[PDB]
């Protein structure tokens, strides 16, 4: 839908970032020239940042612009959502307004299943899904640590980290390893002063130019205008 | 919707069981003569059974047919669902068929909120709702114990306990006390041999005569035909 996975061998594969974007369970579609490049490059910076902090990620190296070399993992069938500020689907689950500052981070577990439209699950559903309580606890522990690292990093750059989605897999040693991507597609980012979205919500809710919004994030983090 | 709550004093109130039944977030409505009486009487038997087993319930005594004397509690805004067999909403959350025997009980937490249509929550939402992790853990621990007591009791009477909903409150000592009702309205009950519903699903999905189904449960448990 937004990425291709290309085999290399048993140990590694290629994650390719496409210009394609979707929303509303794949029902909204557009292409944005440069979006693959931006998301690829922002994922690299985030993976490298988190690695420095002791977070095991699938990130191995770059394979030219839009393609990353990543470790092969047994993927957990989860989307793991961390929420600091109330936005999107949390508005329908809690009677709190968009922009409400949570007293502590909220972690949500979603089962990756297209047929069931990615329903929310708890630790018990997880277990029936074959994911042990100890696996779940260390998945959440990692997500909360990632949260602290990303929110501090971004607050320096005048960016509020509202929420974001993570995915994980096990490597050959049975270690839990951070996977997929971290990009303006899979996070909400607000400008600290204006509270404007610099993320996929621009596309989701037609708030302006998606590529300008993504370029802003890139420029704020790197201090440079994008090469494409 | 199905019950009235009538004050007595600071310590206690009246729970009255009405003939009214609803389904599909209150959109389906009917009255069933005798349903209040059946649900009242079955709640009594269940509360008395669980009390014997060390479960603190709000049950104090009977006030004539359809009305129970119950303890006043600070109610948790939760519906706590325990699931042994796949049925109802769990079919949309897990790709398992109706009638699938779970490898262990599933506990689900729902936030009681009419505006939000009782959305599922996890421990983190609970906390933002003002419910501590320790409160949640002992709420679930009680629900799982209630489950074991009810499923064994009912298996003797040729009834499979598929799932059921519980509600809870704190008494003046800050003890967590089982509340609301336990009736064929708030449980799924299948016949052990035929797998037929003897519960509110009869009404929900027009499967036959609701009152016959409820009378069956009553007769199986008490060994007697209902006085009304
Ligand atoms: O479903 C709801 C209900 C309320 N609120 C919040 O809590 C306040 C409660 O006030 P009310 O529901 O009367 O709405 P208002 O009149 O403030 O718009 C609102 O301003 C909202 O910020 C919310 O976020 N979601
Ligand atoms: O959304 C789903 C998908 C599958 N299944 C179960 O897993 C089996 C998988 O087979 P399939 O999805 O091909 O359906 P079938 O062809 O068996 O009806 C089914 O029989 C169902 O019991 C389910 O319960 N829910
Ligand atoms: O399939 C999804 C669903 C959500 N999210 C991200 O997770 C957060 C919470 O999403 P929502 O549950 O509010 O839609 C947002 O940052 C959103 O972009 C994803 O990356 N992929
Ligand atoms: O508002 C509700 C919702 C569900 N249940 C009960 O909880 C179980 C699971 O319900 P569902 O989530 O499958 O609808 C069933 O026994 C159902 O009767 C209730 O008592 N009240």
Residue to mutate, A96, A100, A101, A102, ligand 1, most ligand atoms under 8 Å from C-beta: A96
Cα–Cα dist A184/B214, whole Å: 54
Q: Which of B42, B88, B112 to mutate to test the pocket of ligand 4 (most atoms within 8 A of CB)?
A: B88
Q: Report the alpha-carbon distance of residue A194 to residue B154 in Å, rounded.
A: 60
Least CB–CB distance from A95: residue in B95, B107, B113: B113
Contact B150, B144 (CB under 8 A): no
Q: Which residue from B13, B40, B54, B27 is spatially nearest to B226, judged by alpha carbons? A: B40
* CA pair distance A205, A217, nearest whole angstrom: 18
* Tokens 């404007």, residue located: A196
Q: Which fold has domain A74-209?
A: D-amino Acid Aminotransferase; Chain A, domain 1 (3.30.470)
**Residues spanned by CATH 3.30.470.20 within chain B?**
74-209
Number of other residues whose CB lies within 10 A of the CB of residue A150: 22
Of B105, B115, B122, the CB nearest to A95: B115
Please report residues of B whose CB lies closer than 8 A to that of A128: 94, 96, 102-104, 106
Nearest Cα residue to atom 17 of ligand 1: A97
Asked if A153 contacts B133 with a C-beta cutoff of 8 angstroms, the reply is no
Resolution of the coordinates in A? 2.3
CA–CA distance, B7 with B180 (Å, rounded to integer):
15
What is the rounded CA–CA span in Å between residue A90 and residue A95?
9
Residue to probe by mutation, ligand 3, list A93, A165, A179, most atoms within 8 Å of CB: A165
**Distance between start and end Cα atoms, chain B:** 21
- Picking from B151, B192, B137, B183, the residue whose alpha carbon sits closest to that of residue B35 is B183
* Residue corresponding to tokens 């109706």: B98
Please name which ligand lies nearest the alpha carbon of A118.
Answer: 3
**Among candidates A102, A127, A129 on the partner chain, residue whose Cβ is nearest the Cβ of B128:** A102
Rounded distance, CA B7 to CA A222, Å?
65
> Could you tell me the strand order of the sheet in which B168-170 lies?
B74-75, B168-170, B176-178
Tokens linked to A213: 């919004």
Backbone phi, psi, residue B125, to 5°: -65, -45
Q: Is B167 helix (H, G, I), strand (E, B) or coil?
A: coil
Q: Where in chain B is the domain with CATH 3.30.200.20?
A: 1-73+210-228
Q: Which of A86, A212, A221 is nearest to A159 (CA)?
A: A221
**Residue from B198, B165, B203 nearest B184 by CA:** B198
Which chain A positions have a beta carbon within 8 Å of B122's beta carbon? 107-109, 120, 122
Q: Tell the burial category of B26 from Cβ atoms under 10 Å away from its Cβ (0-12, 13-18, 19+).
A: exposed
Closest by Cα among A123, A82, A90, A110 to B108: A123
The minimum CA-CA distance between B85 and chain A, rounded to whole Å, is: 12
CB contact under 8 A, A128 and B103: yes
B119 to chain A: which residues are within 8 Å by CB?
92-93
Taking the C-alpha atoms of residue A180 and residue A57, their distance in angstroms, rounded to an integer, is 9
- The sign of the dihedral angle between the CA atoms of B13, B19, B23, B29 is negative
Residue A19, token pair as written in the block: 């210009």
Work out whether strand B74-75 and strand B67-71 pair parallel, antiparallel, or are unpaired.
unpaired
B186 lines ligand 4 (CB under 6 A): yes
Question: For residue B217, which of B195, B194, B198, B204 has the smallest C-alpha distance?
Answer: B198
Q: In this structure, what token pair is assigned to residue A2?
A: 């937004």
Closest CA to A21 of A143, A199, A146: A199
Burial state string for A127-139 with b = 16 or more CB within 10 A and e = fewer than 16: bbbebeeebbeeb
Which single residue is written with the structure tokens 């479960």? Answer: B55
At which residue do the structure tokens 């600070």 appear?
Answer: B74
Tell me the three state secondary structure of residue B119: coil
Q: Calculate the alpha carbon distances from B4 to B14, B17, B19, B204 in Å.
A: 8, 7, 11, 22
User: Under a CB-based contact definition with an 8 Å cutoff, are residues B121 and B129 in contact?
Assistant: yes
Count of C-beta atoms within a 10 Å radius of residue A118? 14
Please report residues of B whose CB lies closer than 8 A to that of A96. 128
Q: What share of chain A is helix, strand, coil (3-state, %, to 5)?
A: 30, 30, 40
Q: How far apart are CA B25 and CA B60, in angstroms?
A: 30
The span from the CA of A185 to the CA of A164, in Å, is 9
Cβ–Cβ under 8 Å, residues A113 and B130:
no
Contact B102 A128 (CB under 8 A): yes
Task: Classify domain B1-73+210-228 at the CATH class level.
Answer: alpha beta
Q: What is the DSSP letter of B90?
A: G
Distance CA B124, CA A105 (A): 8
Asked whether the CA dihedral B121, A134, A163, A185 is positive or negative, the reply is negative
Backbone Cα Rg of chain A: 17
B200 Cβ inside 6 Å of ligand 4: yes
Distances in Å between the Cα of B119 and the Cα atoms of A79, A81, A105, B224 are: 19, 17, 19, 39
Based on C-alpha coordinates, what's the Rg of chain B? 17
Torsion-angle region of residue A208: left (phi > 0), alpha (psi -120 to 50) or beta?
left
CA–centroid distance for B140 within its chain: 14
| Residue B205 tokens, joined | 């999905």
Report how far apart, in Å, the C-alpha atoms of B91 and of each of A13, B64, B136, B137, B187 are.
Answer: 35, 39, 25, 25, 16
Give helix B35-52 / helix B133-156 axis angle, nearest 10°. Answer: 110
């Amino acid at each position: 839908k937004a990425k291709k996975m290309i085999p290399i061998d048993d140990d590694k594969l290629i994650m390719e970032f496409k210009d394609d974007a979707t929303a509303f369970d794949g029902t909204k579609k557009a292409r944005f020239k440069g979006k693959g490049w931006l998301n690829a490059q922002l994922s690299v910076i985030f993976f490298k940042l988190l690695e420095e902090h002791g977070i095991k990620t699938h990130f191995i190296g770059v394979a030219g612009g839009n393609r990353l070399i990543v470790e092969k993992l047994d993927m957990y069938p989860l989307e793991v959502v961390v929420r600091n500020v109330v936005a999107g689907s949390l508005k329908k689950r809690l009677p709190l307004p968009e922009g409400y500052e949570l007293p502590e981070p909220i972690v949500e577990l979603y089962y990756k299943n297209d047929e069931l439209h990615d329903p929310m699950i708890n630790y018990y559903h997880a277990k029936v899904l074959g994911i042990s309580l100890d696996e779940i606890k260390k998945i959440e522990e990692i997500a909360l640590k990632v949260n602290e690292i990303l929110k501090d990093y971004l607050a320096k750059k005048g960016i509020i980290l509202v929420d974001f989605k993570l995915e994980f897999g096990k490597d050959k040693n049975g270690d839990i390893v951070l996977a997929d991507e971290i990009s303006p597609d899979t996070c909400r980012f607000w400008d600290a002063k204006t509270k404007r979205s610099l993320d996929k919500d621009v596309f989701r809710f037609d708030k302006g130019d998606l590529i300008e919004a993504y370029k802003e994030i890139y420029e704020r983090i790197t201090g440079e205008k994008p090469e494409f």
